[PDB]
Design a binder for this molecule. Structure first.
Ligand SMILES: *[C@@H]1O[C@H](CO)[C@@H](O[C@@H]2O[C@H](CO)[C@@H](O[C@H]3O[C@H](CO)[C@@H](O)[C@H](O)[C@@H]3O)[C@H](O)[C@H]2NC(C)=O)[C@H](O)[C@H]1NC(C)=O
Ligand SMILES: *[C@@H]1O[C@H](CO)[C@@H](O[C@@H]2O[C@H](CO)[C@@H](O[C@H]3O[C@H](CO)[C@@H](O)[C@H](O)[C@@H]3O)[C@H](O)[C@H]2NC(C)=O)[C@H](O)[C@H]1NC(C)=O
Ligand SMILES: *[C@@H]1O[C@H](CO)[C@@H](O[C@@H]2O[C@H](CO)[C@@H](O[C@H]3O[C@H](CO)[C@@H](O)[C@H](O)[C@@H]3O)[C@H](O)[C@H]2NC(C)=O)[C@H](O)[C@H]1NC(C)=O
Ligand code: NAG
Ligand code: NAG
Ligand code: NAG
Lengths: 145, 410, 340, 48, 49
């Protein structure tokens, strides 16, 4: 159009000649709204997916204890606490992280009396001379009974 | 001013944050203009068209082929005095910069009031019954008052027009039939009868006739442009042919910009231009020394500007995609680093791999460091760590760390 | 996981080599820059998608030279060091089963001009301002991340995800994973020879399968094909008139004056600008398809590779034991090991 | 355009003047299909 | 889970029963196709869903 200003067209041109210029602005400004709405519909789907994730993390990280790996942060998930934020949510994930590992010799089974023994819970470990059965995620040895 | 300012321009901001910004594709400007017209030395028959002692009647309108001539229409300014000159496929200003493929001049005389009917898409006895122009008419129509030439004191009846027809004639159709017209429901035979009308009638061109009933001579030039080998051309001198240079070319009026090159394509003689998938003209047959030329545009290759924050520094680096520096560059650099992503200029290549700061692509990131300058490096993925694996060794944690981590979700 | 990055010189596509058109395009303004912001948001997050999936561990673990993994044969999926790119055997099949129109992302003016301006898809694209950008992580860096995940898995089990990589004998690890599916660990040790052989035989069939059947990698080719089709459609749309007397911009400027050309040029700008708006819209929608897929692949990495998923049919049919990632062009392949 | 009815244009205007009016309807009606398809592509992602 | 498949005769919507309109629509070309490629992708994946 001759002008971006709608009124400068109408103050200079009569109905027949203005209709041409105005119809261009309607076409271009209507397209600007169509473009904006398309961007926002696409964008809203990014937010909807993120809000469906945040809702799933609320149900599972907060209202429970998730066995899923790295779903509620790195480490073994203990609990999570939600915190509100502008247009979002913040989860404070509490995780148990193994800290100070030691080397041990290990075996899959033990032969006491001509049989094969396997842990009920835990794993066999030797400290060099003596064999113990311990839980897998924390070194707390016990005599093999 | 420079690639940095280009980003400020594109961002409409005087301060640019840290990052890498895409810019305009690198594009060479044309070095010189080149013009190539078919060489024809003799001028067009302007005198035989616009000065012929006797024009044809409109019902028997003449058609003349104009070929192998130069369209220097300036020659007739002194003596033409056209009352109407209207072009339909071109702007009148462009006729000198343009060539024409097949050119036909249609010459006839009509009443002054009927000159308006010569426009394409008209009605009236002239448009409907002796001379119709097509809707896609490419041509320029020319008419001038001819009372002094064609009019006769006793009235000049040598000029005839068709007053009756069974149907409107087709575009560029010429009807010479004089057979009687049947206005009524009765058949008509012989020569005459009631409601039997002779289809032709004569203009009474007396010089005393009121202006508008005076005779007007009309010449209709119909031509096609830029689609076929040309045979009529404007009065522009051809330049010498240059190749492997960016030039503003003009072939038979086909103006453009790009690099000319010797083609291996083979054109059947009726063809002059080749067109791309994009339908952009990509080849042309030189009109003087017939040899097929390729046309390649000069604008090619991307450009990106690596910058730290404006608040931090005004120094920048430039990345040229589609450029191998082992040049098509804006500037020669003291330090140049060729990357799989492109030729990087203005950044120091360091072997020390850091964490990615500004991603340049294909494994390269860049950063501002020490005396400060932009460094470019292959990004580090992390620490390398061989695990202690043994067929009978196990590691078990003796302790724990409770660790709280914050995760933010829109 | 990702799709091809693209960038468009909005002016060069609409108004190639025409100052008159370039001056008229200014009368639209932000529309050209709005297109580039969208494409940059798409491109910038293709690196994110690849980072979320592969870069889960920031420590490049490497395998020991002594492959005493309890009789399991990972040689077919571990790196093949002597090759120029240190990828595994199976990964080299995946990279051959997906074919891309261009390689190396550098195509100079020399090897593309003149006779080859007519011929090549990419040359037609580049001349009309359409470009394909290189990804941040090369196919070698992707393989190093995949090597770290696979090497960490076999040598440390799931511990390397939850913290520091604690080594554990692989038969001891597989014993943990049998307990995970509710089968007592003694069932592994008393059948280790058969279990190891069945894994080795199962991985063998993977090589034979990918060697034999042509349609296996449909998804990764379908993404490369769609991205190529969208650009090659965009170039063909330069042939449309949109109501102007000509598709060729210059054939208007050489036959019409400034005011009669302005009408004709305005139609081409409107039509060609709409073509970019349409293309960008398709790519924004398409990028959302890929993002969801990359968010799935990232979750399968965390839960099938870095751990052992108790979820049903999340890591294939059967009771999930472990999974091994394999890089593929623009994607990831998970080799899901399941007890059936 | 002078009319929404495609035929009322062609029955009142000759080719050159009809082309202008028809071109507007093609542009607007083609835009309507583009908008519809855009909405359905976004919608199909919700359903997917 | 799924939604109604649709297909559009892009020529018949724009240019129903008009030959003059159809000839002018050809001047746009691939638009008529790009539209139906999208709808086919939508429709075909409803069976996938
Ligand atoms: C591996 O762990 C073993 C168990 O902790 C350990 O053996 C234990 O060693 C302690 C001394 O360090 C002994 O303690 C007893 O020693 C005498 C025995 O009468 C008493 O006077 C002491 O007061 C105390 O009761 C444990 O008896 C002994 N346990 C066994 C089963 O022998 C090994 O030394 C450890 N080996 C390594 C290499 O670290
Ligand atoms: C080009 O020539 C065509 C043939 O000469 C002509 O079509 C002819 O038009 C006449 C007059 O309308 C018709 O004459 C008969 O029409 C019907 C039968 O169709 C009778 O009822 C009438 O009484 C009369 O006898 C011809 O039938 C018709 N011929 C054909 C083959 O259709 C075109 O009109 C001419 N076109 C131009 C632009 O002049
Ligand atoms: C794990 O599986 C590997 C194959 O999946 C296997 O490697 C294979 O070993 C055999 C025998 O050493 C090779 O057979 C060929 O060896 C040389 C190589 O040039 C030839 O001259 C021989 O004639 C024979 O054809 C295979 O080539 C080789 N396969 C591969 C892919 O390298 C390992 O041995 C297996 N590991 C264990 C511990 O058994
Ligand atoms: C265009 C043209 O040829 N015009 C000529 C004119 O210059 C000349 O004076 C006249 C003499 O009869 O004949 C005619
Ligand atoms: C500053 C510095 O140490 N530069 C070195 C360079 O001297 C050497 O040639 C190159 C080998 O790849 O590695 C880097
Ligand atoms: C800009 O840099 C100055 C120091 O030169 C610093 O004080 C200021 O916070 C910075 N502002 C921004 C917006 O980065």
């Amino acid at each position: 159009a001759i002008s971006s200003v709608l009124n400068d067209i109408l103050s200079r041109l009569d109905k027949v000649e203005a209709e041409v210029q105005i119809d261009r602005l309607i076409t271009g400004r209507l397209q600007s709204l169509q473009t904006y709405v398309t961007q926002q519909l696409i964008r809203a789907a990014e937010i909807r997916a993120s809000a469906n994730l945040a809702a799933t993390k609320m149900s599972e990280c907060v209202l429970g204890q998730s066995k899923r790996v790295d779903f509620c942060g790195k480490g073994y998930h203990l609990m999570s606490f939600p915190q509100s934020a502008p247009h979002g949510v913040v989860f404070l994930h509490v995780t148990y992280v193994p800290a100070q590992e030691k080397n041990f010799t290990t075996a899959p089974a033990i032969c006491h009396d001509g049989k094969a023994h396997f842990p009920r819970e835990g794993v066999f470990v030797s400290n060099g001379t003596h064999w113990f059965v311990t839980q897998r995620n924390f070194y707390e040895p016990q005599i093999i009974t | 001013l420079d690639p940095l300012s280009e980003t400020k321009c594109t961002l409409k901001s005087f301060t640019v944050e840290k990052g890498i910004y895409q810019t305009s594709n690198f594009r060479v400007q044309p070095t010189e203009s080149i013009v190539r017209f078919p060489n024809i030395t003799n001028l067009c028959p302007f005198g035989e068209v616009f000065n012929a002692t006797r024009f044809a009647s409109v019902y028997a309108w003449n058609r003349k082929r104009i070929s192998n001539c130069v369209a220097d229409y300036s020659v007739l300014y002194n003596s033409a005095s056209f009352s109407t000159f209207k072009c339909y496929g071109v702007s009148p200003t462009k006729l000198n910069d343009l060539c024409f493929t097949n050119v036909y001049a249609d010459s006839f005389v009509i009443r002054g009031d009927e000159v308006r009917q010569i426009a394409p898409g008209q009605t009236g006895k002239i448009a409907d019954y002796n001379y119709k122009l097509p809707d896609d008419f490419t041509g320029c129509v020319i008419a001038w008052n001819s009372n002094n030439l064609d009019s006769k004191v006793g009235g000049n009846y040598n000029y005839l027009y068709r007053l009756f027809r069974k149907s409107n004639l087709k575009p560029f159709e010429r009807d010479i039939s004089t057979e009687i017209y049947q206005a009524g429901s009765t058949p008509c035979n012989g020569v005459e009868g009631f409601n039997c009308y002779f289809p032709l009638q004569s203009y009474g061109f007396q010089p005393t006739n009121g202006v508008g009933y005076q005779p007007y001579r009309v010449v209709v030039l119909s031509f096609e442009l830029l689609h076929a080998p040309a045979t009529v051309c404007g009065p522009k001198k051809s330049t010498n042919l240059v190749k492997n240079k960016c030039v503003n070319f003009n072939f038979n009026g086909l103006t453009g910009t790009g690099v000319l090159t010797e083609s291996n394509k083979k054109f059947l003689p009726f063809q002059q231009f080749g067109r791309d998938i994009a339908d952009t003209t990509d080849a042309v047959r030189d009109p003087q020394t017939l040899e097929i030329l390729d046309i390649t545009p000069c604008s090619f290759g991307g450009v990106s500007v690596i910058t730290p924050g404006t608040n931090t520094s005004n120094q920048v680096a430039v990345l040229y995609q589609d450029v191998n520096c082992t040049w098509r560059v804006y500037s020669t650099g003291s330090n140049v680093f060729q990357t799989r992503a492109g030729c990087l200029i203005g950044a120091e290549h360091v072997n020390n791999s850091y964490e990615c700061d500004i991603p340049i692509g294909a494994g390269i990131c860049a950063s501002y460091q020490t005396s400060q300058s932009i460094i470019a490096y292959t990004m580090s993925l992390g620490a390398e760590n061989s695990v202690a694996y043994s067929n009978n060794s196990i590691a078990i944690p003796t302790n724990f760390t409770i660790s709280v981590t914050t995760e933010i979700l829109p | 996981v990702s799709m091809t990055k693209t960038s468009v010189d909005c002016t060069m596509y609409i108004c190639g080599d025409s100052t008159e058109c370039s001056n008229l395009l200014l009368q639209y303004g932000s529309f050209c820059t709005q297109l580039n912001r969208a494409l940059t948001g798409i491109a910038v997050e293709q690196d994110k998608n690849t980072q979320e999936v592969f870069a889960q561990v920031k420590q490049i673990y490497k395998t020991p030279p002594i492959k005493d993994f309890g009789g399991f044969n990972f040689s077919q999926i571990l790196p093949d060091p002597s090759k120029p790119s240190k990828r595994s055997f199976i990964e080299d099949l995946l990279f051959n089963k997906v074919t891309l129109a261009d390689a190396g992302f550098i195509k100079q003016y020399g090897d593309c001009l003149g006779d080859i301006a007519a011929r090549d898809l990419i040359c037609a694209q580049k001349f009309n301002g359409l470009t394909v950008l290189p990804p941040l992580l090369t196919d070698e860096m992707i393989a190093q991340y995949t090597s770290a995940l696979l090497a960490g898995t076999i040598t440390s089990g799931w511990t390397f995800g939850a913290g520091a990589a604690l080594q554990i004998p692989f038969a001891m690890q597989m014993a943990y994973r049998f307990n995970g599916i509710g089968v007592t660990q003694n069932v592994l040790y008393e059948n280790q020879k058969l279990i190891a052989n069945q894994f080795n035989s199962a991985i063998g069939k993977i090589q034979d399968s990918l060697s034999s059947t042509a349609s296996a990698l449909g998804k990764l080719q379908d993404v490369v094909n769609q991205n190529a089709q969208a650009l090659n459609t965009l170039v063909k749309q330069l042939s449309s008139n949109f109501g102007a007397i000509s598709s060729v911009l210059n054939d208007i400027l050489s036959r019409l004056d400034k005011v009669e050309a302005e009408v004709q040029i305005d139609r081409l700008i409107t039509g060609r600008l709409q073509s970019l708006q349409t293309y960008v819209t398709q790519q924004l929608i398409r990028a959302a398809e890929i993002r969801a897929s990359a968010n799935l692949a990232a979750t399968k990495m965390s839960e099938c590779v870095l751990g052992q998923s108790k979820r049903v049919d999340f890591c294939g049919k059967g009771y999930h034991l472990m999974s091994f990632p394999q890089s593929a062009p623009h994607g990831v392949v998970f080799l899901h090991v399941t007890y059936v």
